[PDB]
Design a protein around this ligand. Structure first.
Ligand SMILES: O=C(O)c1c(Cl)ccc(Cl)c1O
Ligand SMILES: O=C(O)c1c(Cl)ccc(Cl)c1O
Ligand code: FES
Ligand code: FES
Ligand code: FES
Ligand SMILES: [Fe+3]
Ligand SMILES: [Fe+3]
Lengths: 334, 340, 315
């Protein structure tokens, strides 16, 4: 596996974590994630230094994660704080790796690379997720594809015309206007779908519609899905700001953190349902089926030297793909 | 995986196909197989040229297969016939590979190699499957073995005496007469079982008659892995040409190096309008082929790792000539093609 | 795979075997295990010499195992004794490998390695299992981990470790002891909890209680059979049991002592060891080594003796 290890990744949603550890692998590194009694999240290598047991299968004793096998206890910095055996000696060899963690924007960010290099200032901005003016619903899915396939999926939101046709079809697709903005470690794909009638989902939300997506390295995206009367200014539109963040698990699997942060109907539980239903149907079923299928075709494509043929809808995805490749090969030396 | 690509293989039974595509892998090549609205079967590489989505998950739009991801449309020759995006241009890079198909003898034959070389004259003769004088029943099985193991299985039909003993055991097995005939592209293993009580199955062929019979179990192989047997039984001394018989379709197609597709059938000249005989034959196929032979050859496949790691080679018996000759011919074909 | 092949391993409990063969893989070697009409167990390579079918899917014909595929028949020595085909000649090429096998102490021992070196005198002493002074029960389980992890766990659980050649004993006596819950009712006590390891992965423990001053030989006690046999690199067979001198006629006690979770491996510990196996790749890729604790003294000694045996065999 080539991964970009010197980057922050979402390892969990905060609501996933408790005093009961969660075991999750990121970039082929198994983690034990838990919240301490003072509310601070810890991320330890999920391999007890004694005999390699899953720390994530243990419990907290006085706020310290206890290995379920022979009961070594660790603090959130990975220091061994109790050895119930023999003289109770705690040599430095009993300490476990602890990863840099930042809880921000209702996300748990972890740095799996060179710890000397982990700068929290580099975490991308998902502030809408903790803005009182926005209502945020979402969750987690696991996907049996390489993460870059789901980056591709998201950076060309045109696929929704077909993959998600029951919800997302529109006749104005004819008249799609595209636009890509490239910035420093950030790329945006803009689509405008003018004048058309609303898709099934937008009608639940003659109109203009905007589906924009912003990528920041490595694989963190925030989209902007908006619909409004024809003629209505984009900035006056009701919108969902969509969290779509990917984290590699293995070379051929990933973690998908998704969310809708909406500026409309924010006390409306029927709207909560519309959006959770979309997430359930579109993201965790329909897209999964596509990208998992493509993953299965990788061996053939690679064995036969097949390269993708690009269409007019592919600029932003291609630019993002090249940026990740650039980061991946940069790190591979050294 | 080494396969012989310049050869016809059965990809499907016609009854498996419709306007809803079937995704099936042959010789490590994923295919989308469907019958167009005009009735003609198409076989496309199951990898969209754009971003590699399974066309087999798509549906027909105007009788063209539509990619389910971003909606490119293809015809049965693989030519992109609509691009929904931008100026809608369709350069040659958007065409997908199409595979030659011949629908013949109630089989779907496909050429997985160089399509310029696909010669319908080379398709083996299974005409009995479409001869109104024969009644044909059969179906499909998937097996977790290298196809060559089932070729071995079939080219020694003597295995039926043990593997299928409840149905096939004969008390005249020890009087078996064998011949092997070697032709151009073709090998036959002939077995006559003279003078025995009919097997449980043969007695059913004969509507219970339990007096002594002669029986024949012959098999013809054509390259690469298409076999047709002759299972026949008659009152002792009656000519073989006068017998009631089933001509058995036994055709294998590699899927991966360690798995294959098994297309089987019986084309019989007796009890032609008889649904209970249909059931006897389908039952045999379900028990003998899809269960009992599966169990043997899948177990053998699981032992391949050990055999190879330990330098173990098979020990041949008098029953093996035809199977060995076939194996050596498939080996020859593989080697010819490995150039390059 | 790195196994120590030159040693006796348990392949089955006698009660598992009959004239219907059992197919079981030990040290990545597929075996057909069965009893002949005279009761004597044979252990054949589960690969027919003809075309490699599972002999273990066959039946006896006149006391000889018949291949299910084309009917070759073998004796317990692996000699082909009938060929149905043609002239029926039986060249030596048709013989199947037969493994040294000894039924002793209500265990079926097999030697998977160089057969020249198999000496039945070297088979570990589990005589308590057939001593009528003891009530013996047990059973079988499978675990998806490397057998060494289970040997480690067993060799853990006035202290004393005795290291000799292909045997290690870990002794513990607890004066002022506590009876186990199991033994408490058959009684100011001494307690004992000892374990004996013999190469490669065969263990016998000694769990005991008596009034202080009593010879441990005269205590209330159980001798526990705990024998691991590698299946693949990442999986193992675990033969467990106990030979006890208390409650010998109590069938309820027989039942709890036949329990895999009660006697060999509770679910929570199986979860742990199977999880450890899943971490092996990471540990190996990152050159991570275990950090030992005071409880590891015996396990480490055993571990080092196993590693020595492996190295010897890397011929
Ligand atoms: O997953 C999203 O961000 C999304 C939502 Cl919540 C609603 C509508 C559309 Cl078209 C989306 O793409
Ligand atoms: O599968 C066959 O070709 C077959 C049938 Cl249908 C009936 C009887 C025998 Cl012995 C066969 O081998
Ligand atoms: S493996 Fe964690 S304390 Fe032993
Ligand atoms: S993958 Fe087929 S149109 Fe995009
Ligand atoms: S495989 Fe055993 S007799 Fe043929
Ligand atoms: Fe989607
Ligand atoms: Fe058969």
């Amino acid at each position: 596996a080539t991964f970009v290890r010197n980057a922050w990744y979402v390892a969990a949603l905060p609501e996933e974590l408790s005093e009961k550890p969660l075991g999750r692998t990121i970039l082929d590194t198994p983690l034990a994630l838990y919240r301490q009694p003072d509310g601070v999240v810890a991320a330890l290598l999920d391999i007890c230094p004694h005999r390699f047991a899953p720390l994530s299968d243990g419990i907290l004793v006085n706020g310290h994660l206890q290995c379920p096998y022979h009961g070594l206890e660790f603090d959130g910095g990975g220091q061994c704080v109790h050895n119930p055996h023999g003289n109770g000696a705690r040599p430095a060899s009993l300490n476990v790796r602890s990863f840099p963690v930042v809880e921000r924007d209702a996300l748990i960010w972890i740095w799996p690379g060179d710890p000397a290099l982990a700068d929290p200032g580099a975490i991308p901005d998902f502030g809408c997720r903790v803005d009182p003016a926005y209502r945020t619903v979402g969750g987690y899915g696991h996907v049996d594809c390489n993460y870059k396939l789901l980056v591709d999926n998201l950076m060309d939101l045109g696929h929704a015309q077909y993959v998600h046709r029951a919800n997302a079809q529109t006749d104005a697709f004819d008249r799609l206007e595209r636009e890509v903005i490239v910035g420093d470690g950030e790329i945006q794909a803009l689509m405008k779908i003018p004048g058309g009638t609303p898709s099934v989902l937008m009608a639940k939300f003659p109109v203009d519609a905007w589906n924009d997506i912003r990528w920041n390295k490595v694989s963190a995206m925030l989209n902007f899905i908006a619909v409004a009367p024809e003629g209505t200014p984009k900035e006056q539109s009701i919108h969902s700001r969509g969290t779509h963040i990917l984290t590699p698990e293995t070379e051929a699997s990933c973690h998908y953190f998704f969310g809708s942060s909406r500026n409309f109907g924010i006390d409306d539980p029927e709207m909560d349902g519309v959006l959770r239903s979309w997430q359930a149907q579109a993201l965790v079923k329909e897209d999964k089926v596509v990208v998992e299928a493509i993953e299965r075709r990788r061996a053939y494509v690679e064995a036969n030297g097949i390269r993708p043929a690009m269409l007019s809808c592919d600029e932003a995805a291609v630019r993002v793909s090249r940026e990740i490749e650039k980061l991946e090969q940069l790190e591979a030396a050294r």
